[PDB]
A = this chain, B = another copy of it.
């Protein structure tokens, strides 16, 4: 079960891609409507603190629990309820984001995190599988 606690081990997961289940492209087709929208999202993605994900342990209700926190651009996920199983490689994030997003990449990032169902990863990489309607997409992350 050390594979699960390596996800919490003093690291911030930075978004690197949002694509289809077995796609080689960085972003799935139709995420943006034009080049200017994509360009503006890519500039927001270059900012260090934007599109981050953190697995932390916190003292909630007189007991320490593992939760998920994330920051897109203007919206935050703070101490979302986490279910994670190292044997079955399943994951579930429950709660609601604080703040609203105008950027399409930020909207996809926040919605996708609450729809995660399974994952895979190592020390430096994390892949989260999420359902987007009838499809299955993946959010890729990196940790320095």
Contact = CB atoms under 8 A, between A and B. Distances in A.
Interface of A: 1, 4-5, 8, 10, 55-59, 62-66, 82-86, 90
Summarize A's interface: helix, strand, loop or mixed. strand
Say how many copies of this protein the assembly contains: 2
Contact of A66 (B4, B57, B82, B83): B57
Contact of A86 (B55, B59, B65, B83): B59
A84 B57 contact: no
Contacts of A84: 59, 62-64
Given A5-B57, A10-B10, A63 B86 contact: no
B66 A65 contact: yes
